[PDB]
Design a protein around this ligand. Structure first.
Ligand code: ZN
Ligand code: ZN
Lengths: 149, 148
């Protein structure tokens, strides 16, 4: 009875929030689309264009960590993620749909009761997990590489 | 359930001297910080260099980049400040410069892959056998960290 991918992410992240659910989905989609790691020394590098909870799902499931210099953050307030296996020619790019981010913002108000705020947290997670893939993000496989600094 | 070392190595993806540094800093911080004072108190960590070591801190001290709880101020220094939010204290750990110097002597640009991996194992064990006094200096100081 191993921990599930979800349980591993939440254990590491330390709470359940809509933004970690977004990262769980991006991580799993990247796992699916990137294909088979081509060599033992090939590393998954990721460039994220915003720093948020989501990064932690990427660290746990894609194994691209801050400590390895494999997770690269360029803060531009964009929910866009570029994934690359080293030695390959390709970037797997995922951009979360703007409508998704818009809706999640509505669930955070400064003047909520703690009960109300927590209800909206759980609603946001339902929302993220029930989106169809095409509604959730846009995927482009493009020529490109990432490298460590 | 995995051991703390298993958890760190599995997350980090290899066993290197720098992860061993981080592991020891993380367990010393877990010891010296004391009991988390409230369910809403968070461990924030400010690190003065980005290296493998940070992964141990993320896993064991729970201070992750996704949570904005791990804060990197890149100054090429193996110094770490730990803070439970709501408290008055910073727990500061500085890895001994002699330790870093010795680890640097184990890296050479044109090693064989075999020689290099031998030196990796030597360096890991070197970190793990250090006495605490030899490994780092600890200061508990008045101060706070907050998320940016
Ligand atoms: Zn979160
Ligand atoms: Zn390492």
């Amino acid at each position: 009875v191993e921990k599930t991918p979800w349980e591993l992410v939440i254990d590491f992240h330390g709470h359940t929030c809509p933004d970690i659910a977004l990262g769980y989905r991006i991580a799993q989609l990247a796992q699916r689309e990137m294909g088979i790691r081509p060599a033992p020394d090939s590393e998954c590098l990721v460039k994220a264009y915003t720093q948020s909870c989501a990064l932690d799902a990427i660290q746990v499931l894609n194994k691209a960590t801050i400590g390895r210099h494999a997770l690269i953050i360029e803060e531009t307030h964009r929910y866009m993620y570029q994934f690359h296996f080293t030695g390959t020619q390709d970037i797997h790019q995922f951009t979360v749909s703007p409508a998704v981010l818009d809706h999640l913002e509505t669930l955070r108000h400064p003047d909520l009761s703690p009960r109300e705020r927590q209800n909206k947290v759980l609603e946001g997670v339902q929302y993220v997990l029930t989106l169809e893939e095409s509604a959730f993000c846009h995927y482009d496989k493009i020529p490109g590489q990432l490298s460590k600094i």
